[PDB]
């Protein structure tokens, strides 16, 4: 018997409702955080946002032209007219990502835009035998398409030094920063870790461009099949200290950190 | 013969699009601002957004009760479930409006959350006869509506100290200003009237740095299909531009005439 306990884990914050359902066991919603749909800040980050410091591009189209200096950014747009990457997108090792922004000439439609638009896919909250928490999408998601942003606290990394908890930390790459999502996160702080994932994590700037604050956003790796559970990779400074605790359940045949 | 210059002025980062028509000279759409939609700033604006520091409520209804304690912030909600502000909402001597935030525990569709939603109302960019642009509805707006927000780049008193160009500026109160000179929205084309049909109304959002109150337009009665918008500029514009120009407000009240 699967129990409905959240039909929205987000409260309208998305653009469609995130159920969280529990099969396993009598564990209710989880509520020892709150629920944010973008990156929050308790002490002030600095974070560059005079428009003057925006490079945009001033395309007379929709951006679709090796001229848009937004694409040239970013290497080239890596995005096609439906906003998955192309099939050229390097997973194993992504450029940055720029989008098109509010000082750029173009239209707020433009091919350049698709993280800045936000959460779409249709994913739920749910209790897996082993590990928690999870999270799963309930539709197929083509390969290259926007799943997810990794949201939270903005945090430098000399605070992340003194917090106990480490274990939803997304480390954005000198003076380094961090998203912790223990206190504040969306639906991101869920998902579980795959040594094969699913999910391949992107830095995108969109709003602004200050290279230190990368926003995170998870793109499919695949075709995400309907019930499948989302996996990203934590990588080696998660396993470096998590490994000393417990070994990785991913169970994938290729694992590392078993 | 009415022009049509642009579809919307906006390229499309409204929920509607803002048109532009001219049917009384040559002169193309405006094209010496950048349009944005929200506030910008060019110099930093150290805005306290520490999410810890906001005040939230704790409701368990769509916020439309006595108990919600954002709506207490302004003594009460002053929306009603169509997001007008009421009758007896003080249009003379306007409160602050507290609306909702991600801290509070109701949902995103609660009844205390009108401004941040965004432009609704059908707007249009015209030329006018003797005023330059201008905007107008091109809908019946009913009273107490939320038209638009006065949008552009926040900056400080002694930055506005220096600036030539003050034909677009909104005083906010240490006191800070929106220039919408350079970056500003459709606001940044409304002309001023003695007797006007738009209040601005303080408002806090994602925020509530007191210094930074965004500024809501509201309709003060039911403005009519076709009517140009306009609000008092107030004392201080006219106290140094009436050295240079008189209202064409047309006012049979007009003070500044
Ligand atoms: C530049 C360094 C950024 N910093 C400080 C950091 N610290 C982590 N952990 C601890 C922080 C508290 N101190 C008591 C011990 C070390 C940490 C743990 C992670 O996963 C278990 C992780 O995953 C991606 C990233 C992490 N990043
Ligand atoms: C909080 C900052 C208040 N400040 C500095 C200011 N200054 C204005 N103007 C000038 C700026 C350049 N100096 C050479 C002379 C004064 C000004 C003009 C306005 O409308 C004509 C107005 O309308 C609402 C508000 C204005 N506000
Ligand atoms: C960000 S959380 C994921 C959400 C978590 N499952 C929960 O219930 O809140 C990361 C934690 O979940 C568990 N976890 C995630 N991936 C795992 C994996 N591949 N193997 C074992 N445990 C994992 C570990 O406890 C890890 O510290
Ligand atoms: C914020 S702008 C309004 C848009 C302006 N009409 C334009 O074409 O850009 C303010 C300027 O418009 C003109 N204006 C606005 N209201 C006026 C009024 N009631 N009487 C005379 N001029 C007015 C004045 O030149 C004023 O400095
Ligand atoms: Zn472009
Ligand atoms: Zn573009
Ligand atoms: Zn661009
Ligand atoms: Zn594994
Ligand atoms: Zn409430
Ligand atoms: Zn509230
Ligand atoms: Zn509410
Ligand atoms: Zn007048």
Redesign the interface.
């Known amino acids: 018997v699967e129990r409905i306990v959240s039909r929205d884990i987000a409260?309208?914050?998305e653009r469609i409702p995130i159920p969280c359902v529990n099969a396993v066991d009598s564990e209710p919603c989880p509520s020892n955080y709150?629920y944010?749909?973008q990156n929050?800040?308790?002490?002030?980050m600095?974070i560059?946002?005079?428009?003057?410091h925006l490079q945009y591009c001033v395309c007379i189209d929709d951006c679709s032209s090796s001229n848009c200096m937004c694409g040239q950014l970013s290497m080239r747009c890596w995005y096609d007219k439906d906003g998955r990457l192309l099939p050229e997108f390097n997973m194993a090792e992504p450029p940055l990502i720029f989008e098109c922004n509010?000082?750029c000439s173009?239209?707020?439609?433009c091919r350049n835009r698709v993280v800045q638009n936000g959460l779409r896919a249709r994913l739920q909250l749910y209790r897996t035998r082993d590990m928690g928490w999870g999270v799963r999408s309930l539709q197929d998601i083509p390969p290259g398409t926007f799943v997810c942003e990794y949201v939270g606290?903005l945090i430098s990394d000399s605070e992340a030094d003194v917090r106990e908890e480490d274990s939803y930390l997304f480390d954005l790459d000198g003076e380094v920063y961090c998203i912790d999502a223990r206190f504040?996160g969306n639906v991101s702080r869920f998902i579980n870790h795959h040594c094969e994932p699913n999910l391949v994590p992107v830095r995108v700037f969109m709003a602004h461009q200050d290279l230190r604050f990368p926003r995170i956003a998870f793109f499919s790796t695949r075709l995400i099949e309907a019930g499948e559970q989302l996996g990203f990779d934590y990588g080696e400074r998660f396993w470096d200290i998590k490994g000393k605790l417990f070994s990785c359940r991913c169970g994938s045949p290729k694992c590392r950190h078993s």
């Open positions: 409260r309208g914050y709150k944010v749909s929050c800040v308790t002490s002030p600095n560059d946002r005079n428009i003057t509010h000082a173009c239209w707020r439609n606290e504040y």
